[PDB]
Antibody
Framework: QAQLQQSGAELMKPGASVKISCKATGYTFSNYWIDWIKQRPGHGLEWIGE????????NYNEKFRGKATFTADTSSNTAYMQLSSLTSEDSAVYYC????????????WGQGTTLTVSSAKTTPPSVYPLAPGSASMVTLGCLVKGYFPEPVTVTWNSGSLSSGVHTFPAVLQSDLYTLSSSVTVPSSPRPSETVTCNVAHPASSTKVDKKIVPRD | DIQMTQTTSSLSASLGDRVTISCRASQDINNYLNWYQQKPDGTVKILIY???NLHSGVPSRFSGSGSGTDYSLTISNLEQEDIATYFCQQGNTLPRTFGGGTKLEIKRADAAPTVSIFPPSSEQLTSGGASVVCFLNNFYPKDINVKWKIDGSARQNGVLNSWTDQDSKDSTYSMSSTLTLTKDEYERHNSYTCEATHKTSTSPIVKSFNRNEC
């Protein structure tokens, strides 16, 4: 199963640089070219450039020119892309792909990395539990407030509960994000049984467990 | 540079239906037009390469025609898993360009949201903050409304919302809303109301709670 393990650094202050990393194992690394695409939340999927791992090669977009530089590495099999003179617009999700020789398509895409240019202090997601208040199916919740940068990982029952679950995108209110997730279950299950939403946040390497308990 | 254009940016369709997404190019492309699929969560996988027609090991209900400037991808039988955004991309000249996209939706029966409001947690109150969460889940169509009435009054301040992409196992949507205030103002009132207005009920589905009741 040829694929590309992605996800370089996600947060660096505006005015500095980073190096999103792209591992491509599942075929011969130096045989095919690699592609770097950009997707800003305004849904524009811009084509950056492309490199051929064996040679030196390259074809940059006369836009990200000087804004991006493609690094080799034949040894470990990992492509790199350093982005400098970073600002608020470089903040986006970057993709690495493989082009298939003969025709110029991107046959295998990585899972892309999310870059966040910003001078904001990382902060632990405060986790409060959402328990029904007015004394079959009941929905409960977890409110993940004030955390930077993205993202967090919200799960119910260490992964055991995955249906009736709903995790809503976050909302930046003022330098901080705040997101919540909901999970519905048959009434019998709770509070007859335990329901815990574990939230993760690598940025602050915080990993919390908050179980919903009756009457708030 | 070559401007790739996709006519409709969004498309709704019922299951079983055939669907044809069209992508146009700034000029002949010698048939160098590919097609991709990006379901939510960013996952993307190709669909067709060279001027449509050609697959990669993907489903057989996907196909595409195209000559010089006008190509187009086609979904024959719509399955409740085809909901995603589809792009096109010419790999003929440089630099390589993509179309604008085309979010595909699966029309399904009009349903009502299941509402649920929640009072501040014991934990956040200790910190001087009062956030009230209300959930409006599994509704269709996506256009719904939410208003907060504190002690029979207005919202507008302290409310942040968040809609979800259409679910892939029941073509439904869900919305979350959050009324925030200083613990101090939370204690200045007794009734807190989440008023949701959709078009499946000629009367807003309502949930709310008071403070001494708890």
């Amino acid at each position: 199963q040829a694929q590309l393990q992605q996800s370089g650094a996600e947060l660096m202050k505006p005015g500095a640089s980073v190096k999103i990393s792209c591992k491509a194992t599942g075929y011969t690394f130096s045989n095919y070219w690699i592609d770097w695409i950009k997707q800003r939340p305004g849904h524009g999927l811009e084509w950056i450039g492309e490199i051929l791992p064996g040679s030196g090669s390259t074809n940059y977009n006369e836009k990200f020119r000087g804004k991006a530089t493609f690094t080799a590495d034949t040894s470990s099999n990992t492509a790199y892309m350093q982005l400098s003179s970073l600002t608020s617009e470089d903040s986006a999700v970057y993709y690495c792909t493989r082009r298939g020789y003969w025709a110029y398509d991107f046959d295998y895409w990585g899972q892309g990395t999310t870059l966040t240019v910003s001078s904001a202090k990382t902060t632990p997601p405060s986790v409060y539990p959402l328990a029904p208040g007015s004394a079959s199916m009941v929905t409960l919740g977890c409110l993940v407030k004030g955390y930077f940068p993205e993202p967090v990982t919200v799960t119910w029952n260490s992964g055991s509960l995955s249906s009736g679950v709903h995790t809503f995108p976050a909302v930046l209110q003022s330098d901080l994000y705040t997101l919540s997730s909901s999970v519905t279950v048959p009434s019998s299950p709770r509070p007859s049984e335990t329901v815990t939403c574990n939230v993760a946040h690598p940025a602050s390497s915080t990993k919390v467990d908050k179980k919903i308990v009756p009457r708030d | 540079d070559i401007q790739m254009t996709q006519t409709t940016s969004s498309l709704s369709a019922s299951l079983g239906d055939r669907v044809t997404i069209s992508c146009r190019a700034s000029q002949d492309i010698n048939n160098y037009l590919n097609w991709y699929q990006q379901k939510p969560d960013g996952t993307v996988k190709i669909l067709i390469y060279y001027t449509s027609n050609l697959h990669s090991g993907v489903p057989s209900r996907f196909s595409g025609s195209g000559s010089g400037t006008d190509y187009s991808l086609t979904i024959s039988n719509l399955e409740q898993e085809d909901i995603a955004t589809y792009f096109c991309q010419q790999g003929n000249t440089l630099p390589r360009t993509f179309g604008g996209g085309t979010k595909l939706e699966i029309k399904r029966a009009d349903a009502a949201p299941t509402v649920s409001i929640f009072p501040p947690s014991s934990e956040q109150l200790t910190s001087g903050g009062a956030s009230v969460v209300c959930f409006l889940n599994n509704f269709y169509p996506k256009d719904i409304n939410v208003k907060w009435k504190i002690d029979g009054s207005a919202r507008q301040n302290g409310v942040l919302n968040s809609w979800t992409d259409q679910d892939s196992k029941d073509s439904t949507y869900s919305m979350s809303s959050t009324l925030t205030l200083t613990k101090d103002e939370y204690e200045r009132h007794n009734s807190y109301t989440c008023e949701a207005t959709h078009k499946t009920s000629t009367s807003p589905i309502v949930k709310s709670f008071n403070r001494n009741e708890c």
